[PDB]
Curated annotation (Swiss-Prot), chain A:
Signal peptide: none annotated. This is CCR4-NOT transcription complex subunit 1. Belongs to the CNOT1 family. It comes from Homo sapiens. The chain holds residues 820 to 1004 of 2376 of the full protein. It is found in: Cytoplasm, P-body; Nucleus. Coiled coil: none annotated. It is linked to Holoprosencephaly 12 with or without pancreatic agenesis: An autosomal dominant form of holoprosencephaly, a structural anomaly of the brain in which the developing forebrain fails to correctly separate into right and left hemispheres. Holoprosencephaly is genetically heterogeneous and associated with several distinct facies and phenotypic variability.
Swiss-Prot record, chain B:
Expressed in both basal and suprabasal epidermal layers. Expressed in epidermal keratinocytes. Expressed strongly in mature dendritic cells. Expressed in immature dendritic cells (at protein level). It is found in: Nucleus; Cytoplasm; Cytoplasmic granule; Cytoplasm, P-body. It comes from Homo sapiens. This is mRNA decay activator protein ZFP36. Residues 1-12 are annotated as: Interaction with CNOT1. The chain holds residues 314 to 325 of 326 of the full protein. The modification Phosphoserine is found at S10. The C3H1-type zinc finger domains are necessary for ARE-binding activity.
Amino acid sequence: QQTDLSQVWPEANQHFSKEIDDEANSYFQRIYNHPPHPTMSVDEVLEMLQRFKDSTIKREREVFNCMLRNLFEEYRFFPQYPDKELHITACLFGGIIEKGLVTYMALGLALRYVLEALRKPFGSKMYYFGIAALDRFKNRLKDYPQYCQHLASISHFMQFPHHLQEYIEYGQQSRDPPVK
Amino acid sequence: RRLPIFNRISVS
């Protein structure tokens, strides 16, 4: 039921947990906002997360951890997100994989969450979450040939965008596609 | 443990 990813991204020290949550919440508010409210693009949020991830400043790491932990723990609610926000979420989730902001257990989990989304009905919101996330990290697929085999085995793989079919099939062979 | 922003956008 409730997932708990605190072993990857520890909970903040109690002393400033309120402020860390509020800061994380603010970044998400901005990634989902529309003008005239303040916004941040997915690329801007990714740039910040890259700086924070292994920052020597505890507060920055704590906000990174809070954002990633909450994002991943939100997966079971993604189907409840409006289409606009779900798409932004997909781009962010795929970008996190693309930029190597998750490794080991969390990378495997991220890949699994994308794969499970792609298995949802063709044309569904979660299918499109999967496609958008996958397009962000497609240049990494050749490093995960068994993952590519699993993608190719999806019952509606033949309906994926052409370029993604190429990246996946060549990725099964640990290769780039013929053009990127 | 959800952040308010996610409670807000979620249609439950």
